[PDB]
């Protein structure tokens, strides 16, 4: 049978132009009053999946 | 007996770039709690008293001052 992609991981990671994946920074959903603006502002742009857990995402997304 | 068994994560303080080291701009030189090392020439001071470079060069520790206080400076060499 065809490999079934993990649908949960497909909604959080996108594949870039050199094989890496981009994801959305955590800690930016609620109780955003304790946080400084500098801490919020640096969590807005998307980031790249680190090297340590780059093999945990490739397994979950065999097609994307 | 018991009523103990508490501690906190180590903060990893101490000098990062020792004397004679070639650093870049903005690189942290020493993380401190009070002001053990005072900012001298071409180094700054954070809100938590972290000393950081302001121009690329070689670190220098010196003991200038009426109260013989350690100072950190940078030579643009």
């Amino acid at each position: 049978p065809k490999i079934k992609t993990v649908r949960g991981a497909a909604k959080r990671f996108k594949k870039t132009g050199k094989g890496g994946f981009k994801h959305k920074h955590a800690n930016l959903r609620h109780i955003l009053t304790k946080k400084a603006t500098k801490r919020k502002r640096h969590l807005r742009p998307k980031a790249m999946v680190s090297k340590g857990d780059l093999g945990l995402v490739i397994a979950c997304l065999p097609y994307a | 007996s018991t009523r103990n068994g508490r501690d906190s994560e180590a903060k990893r303080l101490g000098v990062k770039r020792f004397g004679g080291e070639s650093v870049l701009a903005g690189s942290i030189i020493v993380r401190q709690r009070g002001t053990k090392f005072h900012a001298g020439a071409n180094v700054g001071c954070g809100r938590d008293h972290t000393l950081f470079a302001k121009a690329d060069g070689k670190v220098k520790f010196e003991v200038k001052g009426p109260k013989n206080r350690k100072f950190i400076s940078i030579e643009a060499e």
Binding site: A9, R12, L56, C60 | -
Partner: protein, 96 residues
């Protein structure tokens, strides 16, 4: 994606974005594909009859990703700014 009980990476992080249905009927056109269609007219009905784009595609677009040599006349498309100069430099014509 199982790490012994702790929150897996695909669940620590938040979901973002939404999939757009308009992107599945839009296709790029390499600048080298214009010399493969017909006697010199490029449109949806000739690009998808030369197997350069799919069947359900409706909004094509010509980018600067090759080298044009023949004077083709792009009938209705969305040529880019860079690919527009290259097409006219070969004697082509762009219209709506």
């Amino acid at each position: 994606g199982f790490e012994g009980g702790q929150m897996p990476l695909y669940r620590r992080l938040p979901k973002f974005g939404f999939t757009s249905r308009k992107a599945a009927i839009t296709a790029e056109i390499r600048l080298s594909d214009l010399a493969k269609v017909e006697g010199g007219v490029v449109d949806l009905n000739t690009l998808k009859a030369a197997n350069i784009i799919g069947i359900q595609i409706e909004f094509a677009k010509v980018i600067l990703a090759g080298e044009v040599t023949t004077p083709v006349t792009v009938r209705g498309l969305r040529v880019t700014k860079g690919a527009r100069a290259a097409i006219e430099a070969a004697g082509g014509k762009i219209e709506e």
